[PDB]
């Protein structure tokens, strides 16, 4: 409900195999890990000030969603169509 999807992420969803319902269903499956949202200013829309927050990971390796604990913003959706996808280094699987 407090989930925020910016325009940058909205643009990547259809190309990386995600739908808004897909993101909600994945989050509903429960937290599977943790990490940090260290996005650069250029990647934090209508704000552009960058992020420095802890985050929760949903899904599984290569098929995940990262949500900023403070903002509720989605920091990253992995590319489900890329089998060689490397997980972001900040992700800690539980």
From Swiss-Prot:
Disulfide bond residue pairs: none
Region (Disordered): 74-94
Keyword terms of this UniProt record: Antibiotic, Antimicrobial, Bacteriocin, Endonuclease, Hydrolase, Nuclease, Plasmid
Composition bias, Polar residues: 25-35
Cell membrane recorded as keyword: no
GO biological process: defense response to bacterium; killing of cells of another organism
Positions of region (Nuclease): 1-94
Top-level taxon: Bacteria
Composition bias type Basic and acidic residues, residue spans: 79-90
KW Hydrolase (keyword) present: yes
EC number of the protein: 3.1.-.-
Gene Ontology terms, MF aspect: endonuclease activity; RNA nuclease activity
Described purpose of this protein according to its UniProt entry: Colicins are polypeptide toxins produced by and active against E.coli and closely related bacteria. This colicin is an endonuclease.
Family classification: Belongs to the colicin/pyosin nuclease family.
Protein name: Colicin-E5
Taxonomic source organism: Escherichia coli
Gene: col
Part of the full-length chain shown: 82 to 175 of 180
């Amino acid at each position: 409900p407090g989930l925020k999807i910016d325009q940058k992420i909205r643009g990547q969803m259809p190309e990386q195999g995600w739908t808004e319902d897909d993101i909600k269903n994945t989050v509903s499956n429960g937290a599977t890990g943790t990490s940090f949202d260290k996005r650069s200013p250029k990647k934090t829309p209508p704000d552009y000030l960058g992020r420095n927050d802890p985050a929760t990971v949903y899904g599984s390796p290569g098929k995940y969603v990262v949500v900023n604990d403070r903002t509720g913003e989605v920091t990253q959706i992995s590319d489900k169509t890329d089998p060689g996808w490397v997980d972001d280094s900040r992700i800690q699987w539980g």
